[PDB]
Amino acid sequence: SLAGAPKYIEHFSKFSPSPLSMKQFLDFGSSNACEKTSFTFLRQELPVRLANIMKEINLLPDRVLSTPSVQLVQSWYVQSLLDIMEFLDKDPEDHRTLSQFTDALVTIRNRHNDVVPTMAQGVLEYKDTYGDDPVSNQNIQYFLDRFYLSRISIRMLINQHTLIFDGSTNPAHPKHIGSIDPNCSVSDVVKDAYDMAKLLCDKYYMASPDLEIQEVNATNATQPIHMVYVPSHLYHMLFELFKNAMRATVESHESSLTLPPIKIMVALGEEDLSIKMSDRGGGVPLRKIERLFSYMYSTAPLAGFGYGLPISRLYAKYFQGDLQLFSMEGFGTDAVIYLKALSTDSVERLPVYNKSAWRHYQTIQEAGDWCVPSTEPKNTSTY
Amino acid sequence: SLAGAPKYIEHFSKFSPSPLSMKQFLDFGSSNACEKTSFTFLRQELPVRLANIMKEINLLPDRVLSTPSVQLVQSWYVQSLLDIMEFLDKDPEDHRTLSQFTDALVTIRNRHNDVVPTMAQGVLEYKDTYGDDPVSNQNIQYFLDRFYLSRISIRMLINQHTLIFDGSTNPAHPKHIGSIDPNCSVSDVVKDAYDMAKLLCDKYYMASPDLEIQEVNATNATQPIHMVYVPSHLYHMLFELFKNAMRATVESHESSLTLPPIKIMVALGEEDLSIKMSDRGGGVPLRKIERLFSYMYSTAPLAGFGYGLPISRLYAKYFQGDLQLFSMEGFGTDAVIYLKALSTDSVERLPVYNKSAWRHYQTIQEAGDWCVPSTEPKNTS
Amino acid sequence: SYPPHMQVLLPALSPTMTMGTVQRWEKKVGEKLSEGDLLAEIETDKATIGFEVQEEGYLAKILVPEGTRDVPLGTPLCIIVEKEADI
Amino acid sequence: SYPPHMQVLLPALSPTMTMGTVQRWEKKVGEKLSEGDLLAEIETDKATIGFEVQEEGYLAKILVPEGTRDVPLGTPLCIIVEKEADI
Ligand SMILES: Nc1ncnc2c1ncn2[C@@H]1O[C@H](COP(=O)(O)OP(=O)(O)NP(=O)(O)O)[C@@H](O)[C@H]1O
Ligand SMILES: Nc1ncnc2c1ncn2[C@@H]1O[C@H](COP(=O)(O)OP(=O)(O)NP(=O)(O)O)[C@@H](O)[C@H]1O
Ligand SMILES: [K+]
Ligand SMILES: [K+]
Ligand SMILES: [Mg+2]
Numbered sequence: 001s002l003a004g005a006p007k008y009i010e011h012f013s014k015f016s017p018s019p020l021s022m023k024q025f026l027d028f029g030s031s032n033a034c035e036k037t038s039f040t041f042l043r044q045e046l047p048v049r050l051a052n053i054m055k056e057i058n059l060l061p062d063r064v065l066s067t068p069s070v071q072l073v074q075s076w077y078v079q080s081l082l083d084i085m086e087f088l089d090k091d092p093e094d095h096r097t098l099s100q101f102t103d104a105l106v107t108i109r110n111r112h113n114d115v116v117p118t119m120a121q122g123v124l125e126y127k128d129t130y131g132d133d134p135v136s137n138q139n140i141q142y143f144l145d146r147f148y149l150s151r152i153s154i155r156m157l158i159n160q161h162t163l164i165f166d167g168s169t170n171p172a173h174p175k176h177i178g179s180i181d182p183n184c185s186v187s188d189v190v191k192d193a194y195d196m197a198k199l200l201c202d203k204y205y206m207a208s209p210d211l212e213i214q215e216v217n218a219t220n221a222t223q224p225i226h227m228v229y230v231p232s233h234l235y236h237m238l239f240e241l242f243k244n245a246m247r248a249t250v251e252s253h254e255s256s257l258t259l260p261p262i263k264i265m266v267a268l269g270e271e272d273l274s275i276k277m278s279d280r281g282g283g284v285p286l287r288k289i290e291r292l293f294s295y296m297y298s299t300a301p302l303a304g305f306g307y308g309l310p311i312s313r314l315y316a317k318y319f320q321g322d323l324q325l326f327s328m329e330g331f332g333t334d335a336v337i338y339l340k341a342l343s344t345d346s347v348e349r350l351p352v353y354n355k356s357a358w359r360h361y362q363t364i365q366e367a368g369d370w371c372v373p374s375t376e377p378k379n380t381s382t383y
Numbered sequence: 384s385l386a387g388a389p390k391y392i393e394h395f396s397k398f399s400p401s402p403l404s405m406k407q408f409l410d411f412g413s414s415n416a417c418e419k420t421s422f423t424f425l426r427q428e429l430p431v432r433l434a435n436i437m438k439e440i441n442l443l444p445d446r447v448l449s450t451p452s453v454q455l456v457q458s459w460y461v462q463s464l465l466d467i468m469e470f471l472d473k474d475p476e477d478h479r480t481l482s483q484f485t486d487a488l489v490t491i492r493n494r495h496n497d498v499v500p501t502m503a504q505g506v507l508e509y510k511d512t513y514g515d516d517p518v519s520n521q522n523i524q525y526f527l528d529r530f531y532l533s534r535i536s537i538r539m540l541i542n543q544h545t546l547i548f549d550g551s552t553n554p555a556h557p558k559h560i561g562s563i564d565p566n567c568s569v570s571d572v573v574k575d576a577y578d579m580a581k582l583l584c585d586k587y588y589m590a591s592p593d594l595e596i597q598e599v600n601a602t603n604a605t606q607p608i609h610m611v612y613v614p615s616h617l618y619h620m621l622f623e624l625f626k627n628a629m630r631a632t633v634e635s636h637e638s639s640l641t642l643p644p645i646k647i648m649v650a651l652g653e654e655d656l657s658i659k660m661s662d663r664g665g666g667v668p669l670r671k672i673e674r675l676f677s678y679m680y681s682t683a684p685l686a687g688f689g690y691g692l693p694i695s696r697l698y699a700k701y702f703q704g705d706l707q708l709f710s711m712e713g714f715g716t717d718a719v720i721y722l723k724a725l726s727t728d729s730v731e732r733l734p735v736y737n738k739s740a741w742r743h744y745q746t747i748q749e750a751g752d753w754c755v756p757s758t759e760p761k762n763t764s
Numbered sequence: 765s766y767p768p769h770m771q772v773l774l775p776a777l778s779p780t781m782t783m784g785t786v787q788r789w790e791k792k793v794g795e796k797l798s799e800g801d802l803l804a805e806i807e808t809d810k811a812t813i814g815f816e817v818q819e820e821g822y823l824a825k826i827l828v829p830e831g832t833r834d835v836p837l838g839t840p841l842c843i844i845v846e847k848e849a850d851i
Numbered sequence: 852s853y854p855p856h857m858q859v860l861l862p863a864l865s866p867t868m869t870m871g872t873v874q875r876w877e878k879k880v881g882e883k884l885s886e887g888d889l890l891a892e893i894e895t896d897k898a899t900i901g902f903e904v905q906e907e908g909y910l911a912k913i914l915v916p917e918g919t920r921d922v923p924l925g926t927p928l929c930i931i932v933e934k935e936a937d938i
């Protein structure tokens with residue numbers, strides 16, 4: 001019941017979300033992936049993940065909350081909570097209850113399909129009024145990484161259930177366990193992502209850098225590098241990075257014609273799988289690197305919006321990896337996706353509401369930790 | 384008076400240190416640098432910098448303070464403060480007062496020569512007892528980056544003064560303005576740093592990798608890359624990085640006359656001067672990178688101590704630069720030094736003690752705002 | 765001044781959690797407890813949750829030591845009294 | 852009767868500093884002031900400094916505007932009242 005929504009939130013937000021390993025996902029979709037145990041798990045966990053993050057939605061400045069776009073996703077989360085909550089006391093071992101559960105998840109996924117651009121519009125709507133505010137910046141930034149990561153994990157869980165149980169029969173990948181490829185060809189995903197970005201590049205500039213691909217398997221000298229991953233997550237990251245590198249290469253070669261290739265390095269160690277994308281696209285000054293992962297910086301008032309970088313990083317952070325950038329202004333840039341090599345180490349990174357999360361919101365403006373130089377420095381030159 | 388030392392701290396700790404640009408250092412040692420203004424400045428500024436950091440020393444846990452070594456340097460910082468204060472009411476324009484001032488700076492520089500191994504000894508003697516706890520560990524790390532960066536700055540001011548105003552008959556160079564080279568050949572510093580490192584390596588392993596350099600100047604396609612800098616600082620960083628690179632390169636090939644070279648890439652744009660050092664020394668797992676800049680981690684219980692990385696990064700940070708490490712486990716590692724390209728942007732990076740600095744020592748164990756998984760994750764099969 | 769104290773019972777940190785392992789006491793005997801601090805680390809088979817202090821006071825005794833496996837719900841773990849005159 | 856007000860005189864932030872520029876106000880009229888908070892930015896010829904509050908109260912009125920160049924020491928900058936009953 002909609003009236004009781006705030007107490008459902010208070011109930012489930014008290015609980016801690018349950019992070020899963022890729023080993024756990026994979027081992028579950030074994031042979032007799034037990035729909036009963038997937039339903040009963042999700043019936044509980046999804047509300048836990050929803051309530052936790054909604055608790056944090058309610059903690060952002062009222063100037064952001066008031067915007068139509070924010071509230072539009074707030075309304076989506078409230079409904080999703082309820083649609084799922086109408087299953088809590090339903091009976092497993094009944095195919096009706098299970099079948100209409102996956103239907104409900106399909107609807108939730110269709111409902112939440114535009115969450116990314118819509119939350120981005122709310123920040124834009126915030127930017128088209130109060131503008132900038134240091135303390136407000138921090139809170140929105142802290143919130144967005146968490147919100148978006150919470151989202152990816154919710155998508156994950158939903159897709160796993162739907163792809164396995166009979167929201168498929170023909171259209172999927174009859175080798176994947178859900179969205180998970182146990183023998184994912186890292187190189188093929190690199191080539192796929194390159195193909196699309198190149199295509200978009202040629203159809204927006206008429207010029208394009210080539211691809212150079214190299215591999216170093218330090219675990220087995222000769223072996224092509226494969227891993228247990230979600231190829232679409234991987235695809236998203238590389239597709240995005242590729243586009244950034246392609247724009248940069250073409251735009252910084254105003255005198256050119258003779259485009260320096262984008263070089264890819266795939267390394268595998270005992271613990272890491274590293275993918276380095278190198279470009280000779282003129283680089284970015286160091287003080288601007290940090291800005292590039294800011295949501296409030298890359299938005300106004302191949303290159304679409306300005307959320308490709310922060311979001312790709314979240315994809316990489318989701319299974320305990322990272323995406324780091326290091327340019328050299330005047331030469332080019334290196335972007336690096338870091339992934340856990342082992343499916344045991346590939347554990348969900350999930351935001352958690354608690355006193356610790358609460359205090360990251362509503363924080364004060366502090367005095368500088370280090371010296372701040374004067375704008376007009378004292379001229380110490382002689383007579 | 385020694386007895387009145389605690390109030391001298393509280394007086395000067397209240398003030399803010401004064402960050403200087405490299406342009407300012409260069410304009411002072413313009414034509415005829417004036418020892419008066421250098422005197423009247425340092426006479427006051429050095430108390431300030433001493434007092435600020437000293438106030439932070441007495442905020443780290445009693446368990447670290449009680450150790451002979453931390454307390455040994457504490458007593459040095461006490462003395463240098465009083466020595467410099469003995470000049471406060473002194474008369475400028477009187478050559479005797481100036482001449483004995485630089486001598487006091489020489490004395491203070493010698494007193495403080497071995498601050499780095501000593502503070503490292505204290506933390507070691509601390510690890511020899513209480514060992515580990517996150518609340519103590521975090522404070523020490525926060526303190527040490529600040530303490531060491533502070534020292535570099537005090538040694539900078541003392542080195543500027545003495546080089547300029549002491550011993551006119553020639554060591555030094557001195558196309559340099561103190562320790563600052565207005566036209567510093569980045570490449571040469573790289574070659575020099577490589578030569579010393581290749582020497583140490585070639586005799587502690589009897590094998591070393593070659594060097595390759597490449598420069599890309601975006602401001603002036605042809606021109607060799609130069610900058611206003613302190614060659615020592617630059618050399619220190621590169622030297623330290625070369626050692627790491629050579630060790631790992633040699634120790635990963637564990638069977639080679641076919642060692643892959645260390646590659647250097649020097650780039651200059653409108654704002655950054657960037658030096659990338661690539662080696663194929665087999666790399667480090669990512670979870671271990673952040674650990675390489677920890678003071679407590681690289682100390683137990685060619686490759687000497689463990690403070691090479693953290694300290695070199697502080698040199699890089701001291702004039703608004705950085706030192707970033709990124710590897711690929713099983714391949715190699717890139718290490719990047721980032722320096723501002725303009726002497727106007729190369730401003731001193733100094734810790735201020737204030738209420739904001741106070742609360743960084745006064746925090747406690749919180750829960751994480753992220754989910755920590757179970758150590759025995761539920762069997763899903 | 766002989767009061768009825770405040771009791772610390774193990775709650776459901778996960779909705780289907782019926783028992784939990786008391787991993788790591790982050791507060792020792794005779795410590796200050798402000799509403800919100802990290803009291804201990806509680807680990808189930810699904811998560812490792814940081815158990816936070818709800819009611820203000822001071823920790824006087826611990827009923828369940830570090831490393832005790834499978835402690836059920838509603839189980840007393842430690843005692844809270846408002847006054848620090850118990851040390 | 853006069854409300855128990857606090858006054859904020861400009862201090863020397865450098866030991867030789869006798870006067871300084873008031874860069875910008877980081878706390879507007881009517882705001883609470885917990886000890887530690889960044890009140891304003893003060894810029895001299897040697898440094899820009901974050902000026903912090905020392906006693907609790909509220910911002911009542913600004914006496915010296917933003918951008919005001921070279922204000923001598925001991926000069927009042929704003930009035931602080933310990934009570935909320937001024938808004
Ligand atoms: N390889 C690169 N070289 C130079 N600049 C880059 C590179 N990658 C990113 N940037 C800069 O960082 C920003 C890219 O951030 P990003 O989040 O990818 O948004 P976007 O590429 O502008 N558009 P989109 O990703 O489609 O939303 C751009 O403004 C670029 O100036
Ligand atoms: N280029 C590199 N390749 C692989 N490992 C590295 C590299 N650089 C640093 N490391 C690791 O980081 C650790 C710390 O390095 P560093 O701080 O330079 O101290 P150190 O090399 O151990 N000896 P010292 O420099 O005398 O203190 C090293 O022991 C290496 O394991
Ligand atoms: K929670
Ligand atoms: K200070
Ligand atoms: Mg992009």
Ligand SMILES: [Mg+2]
Pocket residue numbers: 623626627686687691692
């Ligand atoms: Mg070293």
